[PDB]
Design a protein around this ligand. Structure first.
Ligand SMILES: [Zn+2]
Ligand SMILES: [Zn+2]
Lengths: 1102, 48, 67
């Protein structure tokens, strides 16, 4: 059969995912870091000098990670799974070449190790790089693991992708009853500042910088930037439009209102307002200080006597202000996807290593000064002993930042937290969706839903369904299936190209004609103007399609703001589109035939100009066809495959276009909590918590996404036989009816594995913990506490541990000779089985014991299930098989789900999944429920009819309890059901009395500590509304904190032992019961100078 | 109201500090170092 | 992991049909549907038992720690 371009252009998606994986943002970022950013940091901080001893220097020549020049092979790294087991860090050493001078004129190189680099999994420096599943089996790694995370001290940490507003770009925002402000958060390589730019009153425009004391009138700054005609100021910021002239003319008057101006006068004015520079170079406090004020006002550093570039930047800043003044809706949406950048793990680590290396260099030079301050016998030989010692700080800080997620950067001066998160191991999809997850910038005033709404501009860039619930709804975002994040490209090769293509530099343009023709902006900066912007843009796009410029550089034109924009910075989200030229697509299936046969990988589609990346901004200039059949002769691009607007996790849903969107979002939530298969080495893993399905099945109705992400290899769920009917009355409100004897045969059967870690730590007294024990009774048998403990004092593998038994018999020295018992005791309502005991040591030569406790779990009453469509519920009842309805063949549903869950939720995709799965099981073929596609319902009905079933999947069942025919036909077929990690066995809590917090003498706070349930303000209000005073007393004093205090009747002060200890008499002391909270509050008030004296009267005497 | 003692305004100037009872500011046992860990209020009153 | 002994819904023994199904697919190749029907898996529950099974025990055995 010949290739058809419409239904075979989707193979570009597997071709693209083959070389550009889902976890590729992290991988590319880390590879770029360790390959070039390390070099850049070493070259920037290349020479640390000393004030003393000028004939002496230290030069950083080269930097390398994990490889020396002694051999072609790399250094042996501890394998990542061994790092996970041994609670160490998967890291490679950093090497540098050092040019340190000798006292006798000797020049030499070296290969010096200055610390350890926490290596990303499956990066260029990783041992799992291009491993063929046999090397992976040998290294105890799942070949289906995403990689892209770090193992620091045995913990898998992922540096989440970060959203932020784009730097070095103008953002104009309006307001009601406040005025208009528009900012430019400008980040240089060493200083970040926000040149805020506000209007105060009378339509007067001011510039408001952090360094400047008071907002400067805009005419002052425009004159200070060399633009001093004061007619070209208004020509630059208003052009020929009469309205903007009137709006802006007020702050021309205030330019002369103070006094008329030269450039240098306004320079001195602006320089007067500079705040301080920590009192260094004080002799610059003149008109010269304004030069640094202007040069460090933005990212357009001026290194000459020409200020036209910054002057025009401020002029366009002002002009955007003035357009916003004339009308709102000329402001730009702050939640637009094109106005945001994605910073990645490599960038984070590059900046963190920059800070750590700066600290390392400063402390090394301090040590150098301390060594060389001695007068005599200053030998030079082996000046690197100190560097051998001082290499530990780089490793320590680099590990601690990733482990904690807190990033204390002194140079740039912000404290950000939550950078890294422990990788989710609930399920394979949980880990994969934790990768490709994006966190949005904080300080957002979450009270509004501004940055919470779905934007249309995220189409094909961010998944439209994979958003969390509860609190981070719309803030945590996920990458779409087929996306790319641009890298930084040097802009000076392409400014030259713009000049070649007809752009006239702003130094050749006059102010009067600037708003006559289009301007050309490079990364937000007006570099020049051009005639024929359409032709310029077309030429640039042709030059990019032919590979003369980077395919990630974006060019687009703006009609409202007369501007051609070119973006080369990294962090821009983009996706590939098929180029449509002259009303025809450019792929035409000869390329598809070559692609399928083996030639022409995805990159060659870019090299031949058949596909190109479009960021959110070029999509404004594009006109995309979703399909081939709607290619009209005005369209610029063609969708490769439209289901890629859903992410990896949302791709688990069959027929999501037939569902209500909240159901798809809820399934994105639930699939991450589904219990299934973790990895091919999941039984080699020793994790803190791990739920595993005993008999996972691949879904009968799958999608293209689940096979692209290999979810059918580690599926989390089972294809339950489902009868959609009301049954037994225990299935109202999402509750499910589960079949006993389907549970007996292993349906929904899972197990949980839990690790407990103990270290036998050495102490300064040369003492350490021990694991000796296993005391016996006189009959030889161990005591009950030690029934499963083994001779070594560590529980025996395979033995059951009941609650109260010891499986780690650790003894601690009493003078950390004599050992006090501190054994690890099993505290579980249900018994577990020791399935693994691992003895090892960590990198710091210290004993490490890990015990894996496994526990089989029968699906019981209250356990949660879901069905890939947001239809979750607990088991309401477990019924015998003979009580279940049966069909003519005797098929009995495993699960019965209420039909009442359908009409209001409108999960038609679930019904289509039932029919498609029934047709698939009867036909022997796994069906497809792909978004915007899948297996047609009519073909499934044809299969059903041809096999003797009703076309709509409704079968005549008999009642299992009466035996008669059910009067309605029942929707009967297979549905994929996921068992969720919320089992009632881990939720059932009950406290009568027990642990109390000593401070408040109230019950503890957690189910682990046997805490009580908090009767809060709302419950107290409900009880008050009932009028139950005695119940209020019983719940809030008698059963929470009832303290029998002694109160003196004379002075209302609390005593002890019936003694006033303020009146020292005990005659007026009486006895009453108050909350210990009241006692504590009175005593705390007495700690301040507040004496809440109690006044007492008799209850009786009427 | 100066009917009762301590109604004099001069008692409203910090002269005596009523150091709170131990139960008000508990000291935790075996925290991090084998040594007991004190708390913020005790540290502040030590410094005072 | 390993093929369940019995169909979850029916209780029919399907754990003795996994290998014969694999050999029906490999040796003298058959379609999956006709291979399932040739093994007596008539009801769709017993059909999905074999059709949807993921033989994860073979992948697990690649990490055998007692070599
Ligand atoms: Zn008293
Ligand atoms: Zn069956």
């Amino acid at each position: 059969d010949e290739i058809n371009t419409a239904q075979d252009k989707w193979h570009l998606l597997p071709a693209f995912l083959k070389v550009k994986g889902l976890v590729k943002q992290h991988l590319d970022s880390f590879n770029y870091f360790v390959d070039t950013d390390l070099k850049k940091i070493i070259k920037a901080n290349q020479l640390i000098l000393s004030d003393v001893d000028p004939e002496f220097y230290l030069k950083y020549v080269d930097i390398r990670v994990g490889k020396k020049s002694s051999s072609s092979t790399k250094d042996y790294l501890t394998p990542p799974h061994e790092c996970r087991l041994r609670d160490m860090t998967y890291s490679a050493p950093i090497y540098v070449d050092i040019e340190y001078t000798r006292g006798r004129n000797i020049i030499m190189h070296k290969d010096v190790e200055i610390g350890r680099m926490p290596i990303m999994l499956r990066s260029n420096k990783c041992i799992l790089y291009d491993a063929d599943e046999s090397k992976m089996a040998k290294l105890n790694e799942c070949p289906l693991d995403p990689g892209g995370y770090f193992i620091v001290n045995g913990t898998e940490k992922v540096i989440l992708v970060q959203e932020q507003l784009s730097k070095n770009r103008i953002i104009v925002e309006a307001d009601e009853k406040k005025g208009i402000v528009q900012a430019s958060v400008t980040s240089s390589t060493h200083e970040r500042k926000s040149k805020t730019y506000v209007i105060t009153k009378n339509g007067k425009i001011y510039l408001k910088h952090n360094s400047i004391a008071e907002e400067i009138p805009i005419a002052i700054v425009l004159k200070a930037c060399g633009i001093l005609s004061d007619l070209e100021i208004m020509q630059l910021v208003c052009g020929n439009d009469s309205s903007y002239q009137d709006i802006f003319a007020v702050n021309l008057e205030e330019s002369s209102k103070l006094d008329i101006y030269t450039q240098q006068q306004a320079l001195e004015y602006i320089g007067a307002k500079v705040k301080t520079m920590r009192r260094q170079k004080l002799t610059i406090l003149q008109e010269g200080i304004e030069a640094i004020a202007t040069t460090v006002i933005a990212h357009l550093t001026v290194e000459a006597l020409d200020f036209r570039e910054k002057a025009l930047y401020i002029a366009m800043m002002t002009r955007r202000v003035v357009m916003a003044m004339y009308n709102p809706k000329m402001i730009d949406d702050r939640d637009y996807v094109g106005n945001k950048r994605l910073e990645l793990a490599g960038q984070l680590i590059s900046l963190l290593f920059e800070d750590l290396f700066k600290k390392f260099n400063n402390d090394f030079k301090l040590s150098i000064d301390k060594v060389l301050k001695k007068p005599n016998r200053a030998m030079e030989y082996d000046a690197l002993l100190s560097i051998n010692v001082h290499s530990n700080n780089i490793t320590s800080g680099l590990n601690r930042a990733i482990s904690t997620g807190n990033w204390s950067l002194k140079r740039f001066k912000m404290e950000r937290a939550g950078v890294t998160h422990v990788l989710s191991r609930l399920s394979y999809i949980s880990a994969l969706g934790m990768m490709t997850r994006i966190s949005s910038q904080f300080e957002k005033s979450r009270k509004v839903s501004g940055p919470r709404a779905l934007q249309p501009s995220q189409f094909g860039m961010l998944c439209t369904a994979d958003t969390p619930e509860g609190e981070a709804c719309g803030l945590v975002k996920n990458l779409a299936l087929m996306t790319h994040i641009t890298t930084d490209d040097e802009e000076e090769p392409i400014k030259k190209l713009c000049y070649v293509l007809g752009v006239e530099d702003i130094t050749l343009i006059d102010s009067a004609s600037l708003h006559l023709n289009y301007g050309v902006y490079l990364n937000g900066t007006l570099i020049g103007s051009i005639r024929f912007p359409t032709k310029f843009v077309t030429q640039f796009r042709h030059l990019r399609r032919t590979g003369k410029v980077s395919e990630f550089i974006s060019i687009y034109s703006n009609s409202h703001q007369m501007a051609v924009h070119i973006a080369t910075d990294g962090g821009r989200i983009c996706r590939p589109l098929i180029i449509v030229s002259d009303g025809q697509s450019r792929v035409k299936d000869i390329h598809l035939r070559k692609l399928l046969d083996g030639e022409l990988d995805f990159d060659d589609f870019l090299k031949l100009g058949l596909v190109e990346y479009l960021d959110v901004n070029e999509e404004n200039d594009s006109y995309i066809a979703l399909y081939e059949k709607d290619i009209v002769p005005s369209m610029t691009h063609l969708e490769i495959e439209p289901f890629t607007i859903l992410g990896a996790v949302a791709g688990l849903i069959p027929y999501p276009h037939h569902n209500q969107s909240p159901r798809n979002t809820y399934q994105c939530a639930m699939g991450k909590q589904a219990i299934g298969a973790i990895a091919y080495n999941q039984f080699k893993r020793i994790d803190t918590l791990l739920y595993l399905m005993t008999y996972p099945q691949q879904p009968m109705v799958k999608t293209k996404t689940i096979e692209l992400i290999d979810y059918d290899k580690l599926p989390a769920g089972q294809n339950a036989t489902v009868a959609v009917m009301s049954y037994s009355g225990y299935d109202i409100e999402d509750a499910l009816v589960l079949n006993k004897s389907s549970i007996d045969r292993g349906f929904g059967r899972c197990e949980t594995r839990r690790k407990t870690t103990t270290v036998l730590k050495r102490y300064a007294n040369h003492t350490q913990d021990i694991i000796g024990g296993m005391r016996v009774d006189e009959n030889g048998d161990p005591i009950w506490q030690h029934q499963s403990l083994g001779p070594d004092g560590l529980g025996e593998v395979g033995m059951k541990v009941q609650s109260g038994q010891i499986y780690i018999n650790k003894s601690v020295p009493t003078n950390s000779t004599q050992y006090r018992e501190a054994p690890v005791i099993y505290r579980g309502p249900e018994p577990s089985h020791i399935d693994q005991v691992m003895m090892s040591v960590s990198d710091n030569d210290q004993a490490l014991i890990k015990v894996l406790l496994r526990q089989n779990r029968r699906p019981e009453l209250g356990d949660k299930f879901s069905s890939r469509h947001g239809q979750k519920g607990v088991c309401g009842i477990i019924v015998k098989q003979e009580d279940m309805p049966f069909n003519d063949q005797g098929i009995v549903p495993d699960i019965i789900m209420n039909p009442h869950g359908f009409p209001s939720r409108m999960t038609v995709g679930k019904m289509i999944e039932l029919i498609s799965g029934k047709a698939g099981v009867l036909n022997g073929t796994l069906e497809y429920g792909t978004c915007f596609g899948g297996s047609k319902l009519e073909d499934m009905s044809k299969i059903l009819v041809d096999q003797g079933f009703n076309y709509s999947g409704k079968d005549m069942l008999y009642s299992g309890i009466t035996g008669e025919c059910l009067q309605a036909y029942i929707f009967f077929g297979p549905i994929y059901y996921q068992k969720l990690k919320h089992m009632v066995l881990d939720k059932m809590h009950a406290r009568a009395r027990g642990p109390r917090a000593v401070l408040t003498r109230q019950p503890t706070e957690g189910r682990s500590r046997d805490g009580g349930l908090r009767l809060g303000e709302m419950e107290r209000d409900c009880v008050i509304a009932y009028g139950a005073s005695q119940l209020l007393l019983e719940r809030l004093m008698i059963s929470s904190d009832a303290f029998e205090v002694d109160v003196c009747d004379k002075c209302g002060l609390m005593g002890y032992s019936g003694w006033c200890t303020t009146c020292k008499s005990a005659e007026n002391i009486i006895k009453m019961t108050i909350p210990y909270a009241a006692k504590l509050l009175f005593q705390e008030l007495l700690s301040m100078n507040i004496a809440p004296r109690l006044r007492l009267e008799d209850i009786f005497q009427q | 109201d100066a009917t009762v003692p301590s109604g004099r305004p001069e008692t409203y100037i910090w002269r005596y500090l009523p150091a709170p009872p131990v139960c008000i500011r508990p000291s935790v046992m075996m925290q991090d170092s084998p040594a007991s860990n004190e708390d913020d209020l005790t540290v502040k009153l030590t410094e005072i | 992991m390993i093929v369940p002994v019995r169909c979850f819904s029916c209780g029919k023994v399907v754990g003795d049909k996994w290998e014969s199904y694999l050999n029906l697919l490999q040796e003298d190749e058959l379609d999956e549907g006709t291979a399932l029907s040739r093994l007596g898996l008539k009801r769709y529950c017993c059909r999905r038992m074999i059709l949807t099974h993921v033989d994860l025990i073979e992948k697990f055995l690649r990490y055998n720690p007692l070599e």
